[PDB]
Amino acid sequence: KVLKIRYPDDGEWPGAPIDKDGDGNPEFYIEINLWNILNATGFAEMTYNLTSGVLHYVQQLDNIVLRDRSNWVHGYPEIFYGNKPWNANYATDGPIPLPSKVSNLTDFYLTISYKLEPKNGLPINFAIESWLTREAWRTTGINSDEQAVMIWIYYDGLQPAGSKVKEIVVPIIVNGTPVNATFEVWKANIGWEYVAFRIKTPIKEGTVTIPYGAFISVAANISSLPNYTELYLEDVEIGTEFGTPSTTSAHLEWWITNITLTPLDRPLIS
Numbered sequence: 001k002v003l004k005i006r007y008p009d010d011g012e013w014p015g016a017p018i019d020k021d022g023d024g025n026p027e028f029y030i031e032i033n034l035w036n037i038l039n040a041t042g043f044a045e046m047t048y049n050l051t052s053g054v055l056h057y058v059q060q061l062d063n064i065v066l067r068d069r070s071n072w073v074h075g076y077p078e079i080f081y082g083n084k085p086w087n088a089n090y091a092t093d094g095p096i097p098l099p100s101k102v103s104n105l106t107d108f109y110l111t112i113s114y115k116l117e118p119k120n121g122l123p124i125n126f127a128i129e130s131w132l133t134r135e136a137w138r139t140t141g142i143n144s145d146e147q148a149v150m151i152w153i154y155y156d157g158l159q160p161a162g163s164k165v166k167e168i169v170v171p172i173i174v175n176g177t178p179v180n181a182t183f184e185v186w187k188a189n190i191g192w193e194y195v196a197f198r199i200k201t202p203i204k205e206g207t208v209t210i211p212y213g214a215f216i217s218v219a220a221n222i223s224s225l226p227n228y229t230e231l232y233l234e235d236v237e238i239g240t241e242f243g244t245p246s247t248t249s250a251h252l253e254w255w256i257t258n259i260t261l262t263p264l265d266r267p268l269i270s
């Protein structure tokens with residue numbers, strides 16, 4: 001009834017599928033994904049109770065030495081739907097057919113119920129990420145003519161890569177109440193084009209619904225990439241980037257109780 005992955009016990013890259021019906025197609029995939037940590041004392045453990053429906057992440061790391069301080073953050077412990085293009089992990093048992101070309105996808109709501117508890121002022125975000133790639137099923141990384149989209153619905157102590165472009169309004173739902181929220185739009189080129197949407201009013205816990213097309217439409221419209229609508233939206237990743245090159249201790253706990261993607265009857269790009 002309980003799935004657990006644990007760093008460092010399970011190796012430097014713990015991860016596992018969530019496959020509640022045991023049919024060989026995961027509904028989601030979890031990774032501890034401490035992708036910029038070279039060494040640390042302590043541990044990180046992610047547990048999914050299949051029976052109670054709670055994803056619970058506990059991290060207690062110290063003596064942290066990074067792989068490349070120029071990458072700034074330490075990692076991105078996460079859960080995702082679709083094909084994560086950095087590795088051979090995937091989860092495609094869901095209602096939105098990912099990967100799909102941006103031009104063929106419908107819009108969808110993404111609803112997440114969560115609670116974040118960074119300890120001692122640890123810089124963090126709670127960020128939704130998609131990667132947009134030239135091939136349908138990428139498993140070997142990301143090229144300079146491709147895109148990362150991030151949507152930060154919480155942050156503390158981190159700013160997105162690159163420079164600020166503009167602010168936009170996106171209608172979202174927070175704790176059951178519709179609200180117009182403001183997002184700063186940031187753009188960088190860090191080996192690929194990077195577009196981040198940073199909410200101006202961070203939400204540290206609750207149930208949040210966002211319309212995914214509001215973000216991908218603006219990411220398409222400010223992009224410098226050619227033939228944007230031919231890219232494939234590979235996945236939707238949910239997790240917390242954390243840390244800075246000055247951070248040597250990172251204690252963090254969070255919980256996610258629901259992730260739902262709800263298809264809409266309108267195109268993803270408007």
Ligand SMILES: OC[C@H]1O[C@@H](O[C@H]2[C@H](O)[C@@H](O)[C@H](O)O[C@@H]2CO)[C@H](O)[C@@H](O)[C@@H]1O
Pocket residue numbers: 033035076086087
């Ligand atoms: O590079 C940002 C990206 O890294 C991904 O991890 C890569 C890592 O960068 C590379 O050095 C290593 O060899 O491969 C892993 C993938 O297995 C990480 O998974 C992403 O979340 C992150 O955005």
Ligand SMILES: OC[C@H]1O[C@@H](O[C@H]2[C@H](O)[C@@H](O)[C@H](O)O[C@@H]2CO)[C@H](O)[C@@H](O)[C@@H]1O
Pocket residue numbers: 070071072073150157158159160161162190241
């Ligand atoms: O390195 C990729 C990582 O960058 C993070 O932004 C850094 C930025 O790289 C640095 O130049 C700026 O001055 O500090 C910020 C952090 O506050 C970005 O937040 C991450 O999403 C991204 O993975």
Ligand SMILES: [Ca+2]
Pocket residue numbers: 018019020021022023024025026027093
């Ligand atoms: Ca399944």
Ligand SMILES: [Ca+2]
Pocket residue numbers: 083084085086087088089090138139
């Ligand atoms: Ca993959």
